[PDB]
Amino acid sequence: PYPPFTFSYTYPPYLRTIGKLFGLNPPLLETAKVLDIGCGIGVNLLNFAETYPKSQSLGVDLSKTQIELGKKTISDAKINNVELKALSILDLDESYGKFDYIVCHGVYSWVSQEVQDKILEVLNKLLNPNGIAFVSYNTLPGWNMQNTIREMMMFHSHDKLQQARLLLKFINDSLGNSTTPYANFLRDEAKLISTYDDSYVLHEYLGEINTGTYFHQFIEKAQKNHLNYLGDTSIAAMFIGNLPTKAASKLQAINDIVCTEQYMDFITNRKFRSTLLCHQNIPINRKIEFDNLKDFYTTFNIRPISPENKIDLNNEQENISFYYENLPEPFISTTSAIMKAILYVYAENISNPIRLEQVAKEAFKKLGKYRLQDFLATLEQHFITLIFQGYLKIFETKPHAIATITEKPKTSQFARYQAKHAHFTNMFSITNRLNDMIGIPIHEKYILEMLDGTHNIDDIKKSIIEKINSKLLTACDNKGQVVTDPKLLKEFVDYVVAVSLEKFRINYLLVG
Amino acid sequence: PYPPFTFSYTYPPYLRTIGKLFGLNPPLLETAKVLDIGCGIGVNLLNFAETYPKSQSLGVDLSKTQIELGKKTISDAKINNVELKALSILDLDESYGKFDYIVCHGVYSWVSQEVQDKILEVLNKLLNPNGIAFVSYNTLPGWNMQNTIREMMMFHSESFNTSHDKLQQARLLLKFINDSLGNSTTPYANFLRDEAKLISTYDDSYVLHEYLGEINTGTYFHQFIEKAQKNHLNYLGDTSIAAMFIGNLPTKAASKLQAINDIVCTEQYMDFITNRKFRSTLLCHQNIPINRKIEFDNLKDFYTTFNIRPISPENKIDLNNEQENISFYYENLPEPFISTTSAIMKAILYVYAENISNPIRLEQVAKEAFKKLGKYRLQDFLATLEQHFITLIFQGYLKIFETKPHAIATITEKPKTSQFARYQAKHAHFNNTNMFSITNRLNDMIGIPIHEKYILEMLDGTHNIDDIKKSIIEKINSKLLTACDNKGQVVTDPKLLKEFVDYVVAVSLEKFRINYLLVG
Ligand SMILES: Nc1ncnc2c1ncn2[C@@H]1O[C@H](CSCC[C@H](N)C(=O)O)[C@@H](O)[C@H]1O
Ligand SMILES: Nc1ncnc2c1ncn2[C@@H]1O[C@H](CSCC[C@H](N)C(=O)O)[C@@H](O)[C@H]1O
């Protein structure tokens, strides 16, 4: 029927990180009042409203259906905090109130110019002064290609109508040689929609016609509306320097954000953007001074090849390798015993953010060798670059979740409610404490929904033993075959319970 | 001031060739009445109106300035055939009569939809039934990129600076782009690198016009043909033969394409996968069936030219030897082209080289190739032309004509050019950019260096070859502004500079020979 969706980058505790990063002063979370335009179902604000019981929230949408259905999901989870109303963006006065965080996900490209400027204008009168605005949209020249591909598909219809995919199986097969004038391109654009899902293609490329806009046209429409450009929720975008050094110099030399960004859209073929705005009074500082960056809880997710126990750190002739999120290849390596000492603690601390100084402290106590400020030196010198490349995540304040197993694990009422409604093809989607959406198998949903903090690690093991022994769950053990037996299923359910609880650990799914 | 530009693909003797290719019967050239919308200065109608003195014609434009200037340039050339008028396309109706050929070149994309469709219906009411229409426009999705590239320039020409103003920082933006793309990036921007770098080419006039001056808009083809069929017009084809031809795609795709047997689809998708920037399309009254079946029986009535120079001169090479492999050349590129083996191919090609830039009927190619070596029958010489040639004429490597043009392939010992081409060399468009631009008898524009511009204005038929060599020696040994070709000298000796001016003037006369610049 309708997708439930939630995004890490629309989370108020995130926008507050972007704000407190650039020298702004976003409002207080606990009392924060958030507003969502084009709320839809509204599952986007829910997890927030559960984390900060004192934070009121108001969503709006034009569809009466979505509003009512969402109101059901909101009532059934016992979430009294949020409020949803069915209206058109053109009715705002103000009232109702000013909000500390506003979020508009893409409705911007899908609606008329009249409502278009009207969005910015509500973001003028409905935004408390230190608050933060979020608007997502499509940008040129990335909109050109996708648009034309919707034209090509749109020009032949022989009925499916998914025969459009028989167009692309055509294109990649068609074309052929013509080595690389333009032909190496458009291969990527065709081949790259064969991914996503049958829903995406039909949504974007069929619609509901949407229109792209230009950076300078958007934030030029944000100006004159008395708003300014704070940044982008994707850090790895706003960062430059992958281009040759010569050009980089001449870029920074002009020192105008709108120029460097608008120009960065052309060389990347930038399709979308999620942009945050703020009132044009407050000055912004894009100088990153480490002394203000030591206050940010960070997470670098890496695991090493060798355990600390079996290795020594002070060794030089040895070079050890970590790994990032996936993969090999290993990413970085050392050699330098000041590097190992830190990275290893960025491993032990996986999925429990820690203050940046505390990385030097903990990396110090781990190995007493040198002073502390030298650990802070190597941390300042090349790390920050890694946090602007997206490999290090920053948070203020810490999210509410834990990196340890509580011996009677407990999750959010939300994730435990999500574990009721399937919307099942790969696996289930569940929202962790960061508003991000996690995949999860069926048995992990059966282990998950059962943690309210009442049951110890065994109680679930039992309830799984039945479900496997009885109908619902089944399982097999290698090589293929199995369907098991009374005792051997037991330890299988033990292993599968330890892995599932660890995944729930490092994914920010453990509230207590 | 304004562009003095002329294009081979707008020539009535050309549009009539594409018409008589597709089985139409365009009107008569001698009496032809041609009309040009947005003529500007109007230099496009002239070299026709002078070559066929009985052909009247009228250009029109909105700019009174341009119109008056053209009214001047025609007088200085003493051309009584053309006429220029200042009008809006909305006032053109029917009072100026019906025309056998109409040309609208690069307006349709620069003007409002109202004047836009007004163009098409105007092409309905003033076009003699069998006449032919020409319209050029920018198209998608090839116009998109180039547009965005005009966006960057239209943006960073404010902040990025130094200096004064438009085209300069525009070029510093191009060289900037290429600098900002190193080998550090090859996902996509190989495409944008090639497309931007491609703009470091063309001309300061082009760049200043297209990517700088007023807003132009592309269209989708099928929306164009769909706005023509709505105006009671039909799609004849394109003035670029090498365009309408498919087959570079694998057979699997090719066949599945041709099967549908609907032209407008087969073309449009060729706009999608080739990224077609512009189009020059000719239309006609529907009313008249057109046939895209190309019968060899209708193509032997076309004068053809294959432009070639041999690697091996005929004197020193045998013909019937089947162990020897020849190469030749195509036009000015320094790449060997074709090879054989079959001595009927040597026999033919060698007569296609002798006749370079001298069109001859395909039959006459078979005859001359027969007299070249008596061996086999004649119908086989017509055969080897049938098997693989026509493919080459659809790839643009063989040029076709109806009514072979007015020009000469030989040096008359007192060379002479058109009173037009001898006029153009008195004025711009400079400079030795590269060289001067001159209009041959085919409406094509040949660059010529300064010294060749000094010889070309000096052939009225009054001066012999030696009179040429003398006046060039003077211009050097005198107030000068000299230039040279290869070796290394450039300089002063009399006995050297004599034989040097002999060579340079003979080469210059050959270039005018094969370029259709010799009317006698
Ligand atoms: N004029 C209008 N007033 C209020 N909502 C509108 C609107 N026009 C469109 N919308 C809403 O904007 C939504 C865009 S789809 C966005 C879904 C949701 N924001 C998410 O992705 O999580 C649609 O559901 C539509 O109902
Ligand atoms: N409404 C109008 N009526 C008549 N001419 C117009 C017009 N609008 C634009 N034009 C003319 O169309 C011309 C397009 S520039 C084309 C120049 C010329 N056809 C060539 O290729 O060499 C301009 O010179 C402009 O004067």
PDB file of N, CA and C and ligand atoms in Angstrom, chain A residues 5 7 37-40 44 60-63 66 87-90 105-107 111 115 203, ligand 1:
ATOM      1  N   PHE A   5       8.717   4.817   5.766  1.00  0.00           N
ATOM      2  CA  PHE A   5      10.096   5.224   5.543  1.00  0.00           C
ATOM      3  C   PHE A   5      10.590   6.145   6.644  1.00  0.00           C
ATOM      4  N   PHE A   7      14.613   8.089   7.715  1.00  0.00           N
ATOM      5  CA  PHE A   7      15.964   8.343   7.245  1.00  0.00           C
ATOM      6  C   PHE A   7      16.801   8.923   8.376  1.00  0.00           C
ATOM      7  N   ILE A  37       6.400  18.486   6.710  1.00  0.00           N
ATOM      8  CA  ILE A  37       5.550  18.850   5.582  1.00  0.00           C
ATOM      9  C   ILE A  37       5.606  17.712   4.575  1.00  0.00           C
ATOM     10  N   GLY A  38       4.441  17.266   4.116  1.00  0.00           N
ATOM     11  CA  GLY A  38       4.397  16.049   3.329  1.00  0.00           C
ATOM     12  C   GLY A  38       4.673  14.870   4.232  1.00  0.00           C
ATOM     13  N   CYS A  39       4.091  14.889   5.435  1.00  0.00           N
ATOM     14  CA  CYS A  39       4.371  13.868   6.438  1.00  0.00           C
ATOM     15  C   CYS A  39       4.112  12.465   5.909  1.00  0.00           C
ATOM     16  N   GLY A  40       3.080  12.305   5.091  1.00  0.00           N
ATOM     17  CA  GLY A  40       2.679  10.967   4.708  1.00  0.00           C
ATOM     18  C   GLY A  40       2.130  10.233   5.915  1.00  0.00           C
ATOM     19  N   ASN A  44       8.347   8.954  10.224  1.00  0.00           N
ATOM     20  CA  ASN A  44       9.653   9.594  10.279  1.00  0.00           C
ATOM     21  C   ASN A  44       9.900  10.300  11.609  1.00  0.00           C
ATOM     22  N   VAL A  60       1.891  17.187   8.614  1.00  0.00           N
ATOM     23  CA  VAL A  60       0.813  17.634   7.741  1.00  0.00           C
ATOM     24  C   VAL A  60       0.979  16.929   6.404  1.00  0.00           C
ATOM     25  N   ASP A  61      -0.149  16.669   5.743  1.00  0.00           N
ATOM     26  CA  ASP A  61      -0.158  16.137   4.385  1.00  0.00           C
ATOM     27  C   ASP A  61      -1.508  16.438   3.747  1.00  0.00           C
ATOM     28  N   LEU A  62      -1.535  16.358   2.422  1.00  0.00           N
ATOM     29  CA  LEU A  62      -2.771  16.578   1.693  1.00  0.00           C
ATOM     30  C   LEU A  62      -3.668  15.345   1.670  1.00  0.00           C
ATOM     31  N   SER A  63      -3.108  14.146   1.813  1.00  0.00           N
ATOM     32  CA  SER A  63      -3.902  12.927   1.712  1.00  0.00           C
ATOM     33  C   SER A  63      -4.589  12.635   3.040  1.00  0.00           C
ATOM     34  N   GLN A  66      -3.652   8.704   4.125  1.00  0.00           N
ATOM     35  CA  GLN A  66      -2.374   8.584   4.823  1.00  0.00           C
ATOM     36  C   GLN A  66      -2.462   9.122   6.244  1.00  0.00           C
ATOM     37  N   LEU A  87      -3.985  18.610   5.579  1.00  0.00           N
ATOM     38  CA  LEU A  87      -4.174  19.960   5.063  1.00  0.00           C
ATOM     39  C   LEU A  87      -3.282  20.137   3.837  1.00  0.00           C
ATOM     40  N   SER A  88      -3.438  21.280   3.176  1.00  0.00           N
ATOM     41  CA  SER A  88      -2.585  21.690   2.067  1.00  0.00           C
ATOM     42  C   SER A  88      -1.610  22.749   2.562  1.00  0.00           C
ATOM     43  N   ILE A  89      -0.399  22.757   2.003  1.00  0.00           N
ATOM     44  CA  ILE A  89       0.639  23.661   2.483  1.00  0.00           C
ATOM     45  C   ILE A  89       0.223  25.124   2.370  1.00  0.00           C
ATOM     46  N   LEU A  90      -0.828  25.412   1.609  1.00  0.00           N
ATOM     47  CA  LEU A  90      -1.251  26.767   1.288  1.00  0.00           C
ATOM     48  C   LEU A  90      -2.105  27.406   2.383  1.00  0.00           C
ATOM     49  N   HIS A 105      10.708  16.481   3.020  1.00  0.00           N
ATOM     50  CA  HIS A 105      11.456  15.534   2.222  1.00  0.00           C
ATOM     51  C   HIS A 105      10.934  15.768   0.819  1.00  0.00           C
ATOM     52  N   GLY A 106      11.402  15.025  -0.183  1.00  0.00           N
ATOM     53  CA  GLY A 106      10.975  15.617  -1.425  1.00  0.00           C
ATOM     54  C   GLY A 106       9.490  15.530  -1.677  1.00  0.00           C
ATOM     55  N   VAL A 107       8.863  16.683  -1.464  1.00  0.00           N
ATOM     56  CA  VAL A 107       7.683  17.147  -2.173  1.00  0.00           C
ATOM     57  C   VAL A 107       8.033  18.322  -3.067  1.00  0.00           C
ATOM     58  N   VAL A 111       5.646  19.414  -7.116  1.00  0.00           N
ATOM     59  CA  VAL A 111       4.486  20.290  -6.986  1.00  0.00           C
ATOM     60  C   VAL A 111       4.746  21.621  -7.691  1.00  0.00           C
ATOM     61  N   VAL A 115       2.993  26.430  -4.839  1.00  0.00           N
ATOM     62  CA  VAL A 115       3.283  25.773  -3.570  1.00  0.00           C
ATOM     63  C   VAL A 115       4.781  25.788  -3.306  1.00  0.00           C
ATOM     64  N   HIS A 203       7.829   4.932  -9.538  1.00  0.00           N
ATOM     65  CA  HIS A 203       7.530   6.150  -8.787  1.00  0.00           C
ATOM     66  C   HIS A 203       8.185   7.351  -9.459  1.00  0.00           C
TER      67      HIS A 203
HETATM   68  N1  LIG C   1       0.053  20.429  -1.548  1.00  0.00           N
HETATM   69  C1  LIG C   1       0.395  19.504  -0.654  1.00  0.00           C
HETATM   70  N2  LIG C   1       0.122  19.707   0.682  1.00  0.00           N
HETATM   71  C2  LIG C   1       0.480  18.749   1.607  1.00  0.00           C
HETATM   72  N3  LIG C   1       1.108  17.588   1.200  1.00  0.00           N
HETATM   73  C3  LIG C   1       1.380  17.378  -0.112  1.00  0.00           C
HETATM   74  C4  LIG C   1       1.029  18.333  -1.058  1.00  0.00           C
HETATM   75  N4  LIG C   1       1.413  17.872  -2.269  1.00  0.00           N
HETATM   76  C5  LIG C   1       1.994  16.658  -2.113  1.00  0.00           C
HETATM   77  N5  LIG C   1       1.987  16.339  -0.779  1.00  0.00           N
HETATM   78  C6  LIG C   1       2.513  15.103  -0.160  1.00  0.00           C
HETATM   79  O1  LIG C   1       3.917  14.990  -0.273  1.00  0.00           O
HETATM   80  C7  LIG C   1       4.276  13.621  -0.282  1.00  0.00           C
HETATM   81  C8  LIG C   1       5.526  13.383  -1.122  1.00  0.00           C
HETATM   82  S1  LIG C   1       6.002  11.637  -1.135  1.00  0.00           S
HETATM   83  C9  LIG C   1       6.938  11.904   0.391  1.00  0.00           C
HETATM   84  C10 LIG C   1       6.708  10.793   1.408  1.00  0.00           C
HETATM   85  C11 LIG C   1       7.408  11.016   2.745  1.00  0.00           C
HETATM   86  N6  LIG C   1       7.785  12.417   2.908  1.00  0.00           N
HETATM   87  C12 LIG C   1       8.619  10.095   2.857  1.00  0.00           C
HETATM   88  O2  LIG C   1       9.309   9.840   1.869  1.00  0.00           O
HETATM   89  O3  LIG C   1       8.928   9.587   3.936  1.00  0.00           O
HETATM   90  C13 LIG C   1       3.072  12.862  -0.820  1.00  0.00           C
HETATM   91  O4  LIG C   1       2.765  11.787   0.036  1.00  0.00           O
HETATM   92  C14 LIG C   1       1.939  13.869  -0.832  1.00  0.00           C
HETATM   93  O5  LIG C   1       0.853  13.386  -0.078  1.00  0.00           O
END
